[PDB]
Design a protein around this nucleic acid. Structure first.
Ligand code: MG
Ligand code: MG
Ligand code: MG
Ligand code: MG
Ligand code: MG
Ligand code: MG
Ligand code: MG
Ligand code: MG
Ligand code: MG
Ligand code: MG
Ligand code: MG
Ligand code: MG
Ligand code: MG
Ligand code: MG
Ligand code: MG
Ligand code: MG
Ligand code: MG
Ligand code: MG
Ligand code: MG
Ligand code: MG
Ligand code: MG
Ligand code: MG
Ligand code: MG
Ligand code: MG
Ligand code: MG
Ligand code: MG
Ligand code: MG
Ligand code: MG
Ligand code: MG
Ligand code: MG
Ligand code: MG
Ligand code: MG
Ligand code: MG
Ligand code: MG
Ligand code: MG
Ligand code: MG
Ligand code: MG
Ligand code: MG
Ligand code: MG
Ligand code: MG
Ligand code: MG
Ligand code: MG
Ligand code: MG
Ligand code: MG
Ligand code: MG
Ligand code: MG
Ligand code: MG
Ligand code: MG
Ligand code: MG
Ligand code: MG
Ligand code: MG
Ligand code: MG
Lengths: 117, 101, 50, 207, 113
RNA sequence: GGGGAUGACCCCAGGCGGUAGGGGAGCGUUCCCGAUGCCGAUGAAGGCCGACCCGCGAGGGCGGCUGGAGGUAAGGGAAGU
RNA sequence: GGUGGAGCCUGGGAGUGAGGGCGCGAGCGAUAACGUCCGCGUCCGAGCGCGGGAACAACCGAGACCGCCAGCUAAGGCCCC
RNA sequence: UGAGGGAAAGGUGAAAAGAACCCCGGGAGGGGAGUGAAAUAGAGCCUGAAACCGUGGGCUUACAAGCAGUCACGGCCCCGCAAGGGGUUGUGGCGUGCCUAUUGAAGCAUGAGCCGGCGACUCACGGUCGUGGGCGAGCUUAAGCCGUUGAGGCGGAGGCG
């Protein structure tokens, strides 16, 4: 019962080779360089998936700190009213009222500036 | 009449049209469950409490569909450790009728 | 019953352990041997009991 | 596993219901059937797969390259797993696959497959060839009245060398020898047909 | 219809035919005829004859009004290379690959007339 | 640990980085029992794709093009796997 | 007191027997070495997975099952990258 | 020199019915026509992959720095009735190839030009342990003999306790 290889490594190289599309040069055509990239593409695909949340937060702090500053208070003054006043509403995902429609976010500034003491 | 509903830890700026996806609820696909905690009424109403205490939304779900396939792959250099794991996160899609209260 | 319905007890087939195979997910390059040494080289561990 | 058997009534004698404790209801298991099936198909293997290993290829033990100062890889002879025309290291050798099951395992397998053909009531024991002189056309024109159309596989085993001869060619039936009865043909078929000779020597075998 | 014939087993390296094919594309049949008439290369003798054969197959077998055609696409592939032996020094030989080429060219109509 | 319709289906508590290793569960290839069978010109194996379906997977289904005659369940075994 | 991948006994199965850094107690060295050799512990090895220290395995925090466009913090910072 | 070493090289089609004949071309090579189920089934001709070499279309690159990738925003193009999806990266952010050997590698330590195929923990006779069965103070066959030539029984010399 001789079991030669035959089809299974051609299918296995087609899975990695057709999984690795759009790469520079021999790491999209050759099979020994396609799996050396998809390992790093998987590790970068994990770590940058962990980094997307924190990077979007680092965008949200710049949008909130950018929008609140011209009212006469910065970010550290702004959050101190929210954590103490029981008005934890914004929660840094609600920057789209500081961007889209600021006539109510300005009222959130009015609720936050009176909560300094 | 927009709002900020909270479910599954996440919050959403919701309109009476429709919204994006939320956590996998224990909701029948023809039934209508209530999303309890909201914020920030639409026209001239604004709140200063974590819960509105008087207004909420009641939203009908559509169904447990099938999303995309996020494929994670652990790899460590010169440890001889190669892991290839598939993962699909479930979702429940739901509309909005009105925000009463 | 007749045939292709009779089957062994599911406890003892052990799947041959197939030791020297794929690097991850099981047992890698060295089968059960170390990196280097007498037990690692072929036909070594000369006389274990004596 | 059942008192009830199926009798032929060839000429005059009515339907009887014979018995013995091997075919009276008791405990059965498919694993002991599987052991005799696997052994039956295991000593059946002739085992003629033979490959030249490194020790007996028609090559020569001569170093193609010198060990150093050449440039290419080190090699010792043409007869290696490398230099692909050489022999494989662990190819199959002609070896014996026979091993003897215990006697009580074997008789408790042969006394259990027939019990599987008795609990369903699929067996049908006869006396002799009730037709005329045993031809194939003159056998199908007796099994048709016996209830054997050919929609299901039947194993007939008898001491007569003429019922075997007439029933040797039908694709839906398999015929055997009375002292040559095994477990595995009863395993392949589902209706056991025999006589008082194969049943008699069968009960001399099953103690 | 797009008229070609073929060239096969030309006994010339393809990299020295692409220099004499990749400049005559887009021109007319008489323009490529007069450019390859005076192009001092070896490949021009083999591309000029396959333009005479291709134009001669376009005017005769496919009546494509020879005044009104040009070269649509012209390309040359690689055929089976001959593995001869070029003996270098110190007894060690090197295989030499004297190749062959496939000079095909289709003929395009100018416009819908 | 529990509801113990013994539920091989759901609750509670704890845990889930990992080399050499120890252990458990699966996928794929050649051949064999099943096979005097089944599928196959209304198109088998193989080749090229799929943004389709299932599966934590080795992968398996389904759709299209080419191809021209073989492939083989379910349940198991032997490895030149 | 302590129900914990705690222990104790038997049997099967490997690997390891080149270690290194850091703080302390020491020897040799020159109170020199990212120097040699012990002990007490940690870390790397095996956590070159993460944040800080500009970059760096052992300096600090922290022990990565997976996913989310959610929060709170440890070390370190709040003039801009 | 010689003793000796020692290869690669199978496949058209059911039937050669192996392309008469016209044209270009010195010839070769084809383009038509015809035979053929198929002529990318054309004579070392079944299926014909990958590396490799080109042709045609979409995107983007001549002020940007990288083991070449991942994520995000946007632009362009193509599918889909739409929802959505597929190709590309302009910019931002984050990022020291694989394996071995190592206290320790992206390593200016070794191996790898690329692709396809071959290949590395088995087997005989035994011992120990575990597991699924049979029998139980018993268990158990070897050599050999009798049977169809894919069928089993006979055979207690013997072994363990
Ligand atoms: Mg976080
Ligand atoms: Mg690395
Ligand atoms: Mg290491
Ligand atoms: Mg060792
Ligand atoms: Mg090694
Ligand atoms: Mg060592
Ligand atoms: Mg040796
Ligand atoms: Mg010699
Ligand atoms: Mg030899
Ligand atoms: Mg070299
Ligand atoms: Mg050979
Ligand atoms: Mg030729
Ligand atoms: Mg010379
Ligand atoms: Mg639960
Ligand atoms: Mg918990
Ligand atoms: Mg683990
Ligand atoms: Mg391991
Ligand atoms: Mg084969
Ligand atoms: Mg049919
Ligand atoms: Mg078809
Ligand atoms: Mg096959
Ligand atoms: Mg074809
Ligand atoms: Mg092998
Ligand atoms: Mg422990
Ligand atoms: Mg030592
Ligand atoms: Mg030591
Ligand atoms: Mg030491
Ligand atoms: Mg040291
Ligand atoms: Mg020191
Ligand atoms: Mg550790
Ligand atoms: Mg590093
Ligand atoms: Mg750092
Ligand atoms: Mg670290
Ligand atoms: Mg953890
Ligand atoms: Mg905070
Ligand atoms: Mg015809
Ligand atoms: Mg042709
Ligand atoms: Mg033709
Ligand atoms: Mg060809
Ligand atoms: Mg040829
Ligand atoms: Mg054929
Ligand atoms: Mg061909
Ligand atoms: Mg181009
Ligand atoms: Mg400048
Ligand atoms: Mg520019
Ligand atoms: Mg980048
Ligand atoms: Mg390797
Ligand atoms: Mg080590
Ligand atoms: Mg290197
Ligand atoms: Mg270098
Ligand atoms: Mg070395
Ligand atoms: Mg080199």
């Amino acid at each position: 019962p001789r079991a030669k290889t035959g089809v299974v490594r051609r299918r296995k190289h087609k899975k990695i080779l057709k999984l690795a599309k759009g790469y520079w040069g021999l790491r999209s055509k050759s099979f020994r360089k396609a799996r050396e990239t998809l390992f790093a593409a998987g590790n970068y695909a994990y770590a940058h998936r962990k980094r997307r949340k924190r990077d979007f937060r680092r965008l949200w702090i710049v949008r909130i700190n950018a929008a609140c500053r011209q009212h006469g208070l910065n970010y550290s003054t702004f959050i101190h009213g929210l954590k103490k006043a029981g008005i934890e509403v914004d929660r840094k995902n609600l920057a789209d009222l500081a961007v889209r429609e600021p006539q109510v976010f300005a009222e959130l500034v009015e609720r936050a500036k009176a909560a300094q003491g | 009449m927009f709002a900020i509903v909270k479910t599954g830890g996440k919050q959403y700026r919701v309109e009476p049209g429709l919204k994006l996806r939320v956590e996998k609820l224990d909701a029948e696909p023809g039934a209508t469950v209530e999303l309890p905690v909201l914020l920030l009424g639409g026209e001239k109403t604004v709140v200063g409490t974590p819960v509105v205490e008087g207004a909420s939304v009641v939203a009908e779900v559509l169904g447990h569909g099938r999303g995309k396939k996020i494929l994670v792959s652990k790899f460590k250099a010169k440890v001889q450790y190669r892991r290839k794991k598939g993962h699909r996160q479930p979702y429940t899609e739901l509309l909005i009728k009105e925000i009463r209260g | 019953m007749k045939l292709s319905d009779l089957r062994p007890n599911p406890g003892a087939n052990k799947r041959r352990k197939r030791v020297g195979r794929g690097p991850g997910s099981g047992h890698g390059k060295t089968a059960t041997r170390g990196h280097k040494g007498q037990k690692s080289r072929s036909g070594g561990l000369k006389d274990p009991r004596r | 596993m059942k008192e009830v058997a199926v009798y032929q009534i060839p000429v005059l004698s009515p339907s009887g219901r014979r018995e013995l404790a091997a075919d009276l209801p008791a405990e059965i298991n498919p694993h002991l059937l599987w052991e005799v099936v696997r052994w039956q198909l295991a000593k059946r293997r002739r085992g003629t797969a033979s490959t030249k290993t490194r020790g007996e290829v028609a090559y020569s033990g001569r170093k193609i390259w010198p060990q150093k100062h050449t440039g290419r890889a080190r090699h010792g002879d043409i007869g290696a797993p490398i230099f692909v025309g050489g022999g494989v290291v662990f190819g199959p050798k002609p070896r014996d696959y026979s091993y003897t099951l215990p006697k009580k395992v074997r008789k408790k397998g042969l006394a259990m497959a027939v019990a599987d053909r008795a609990r369903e009531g699929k067996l049908l024991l006869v006396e002799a060839f009730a037709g005329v002189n045993g031809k194939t056309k003159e056998f199908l024109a007796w099994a048709k009245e016996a209830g054997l159309d050919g929609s299901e596989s039947v194993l007939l085993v008898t001491g007569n060398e003429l019922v075997r001869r007439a029933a040797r060619n039908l694709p839906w039936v398999v015929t055997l020898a009375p002292e040559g009865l095994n477990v595995y043909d009863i395993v392949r078929t589902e209706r056991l047909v025999m006589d008082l000779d194969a049943w008699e020597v069968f009960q001399n075998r099953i103690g | 219809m797009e008229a070609k014939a073929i060239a096969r087993y030309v006994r010339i390296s393809p990299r020295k035919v692409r220099l004499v094919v990749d400049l005559i594309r887009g021109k007319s049949l008489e323009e490529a005829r007069n450019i390859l008439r005076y192009t001092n290369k070896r490949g021009a003798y083999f591309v000029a004859k396959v333009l005479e054969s291709a134009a001669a197959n376009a005017v005769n077998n496919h009546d494509m009004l020879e005044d009104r055609l040009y070269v649509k696409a012209a390309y040359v592939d690689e055929g089976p290379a001959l593995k001869r032996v070029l003996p270098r020094a110190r007894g060690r030989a090197d295989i030499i690959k004297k190749r062959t080429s496939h000079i095909t060219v289709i003929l395009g109509e100018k416009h819908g007339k």
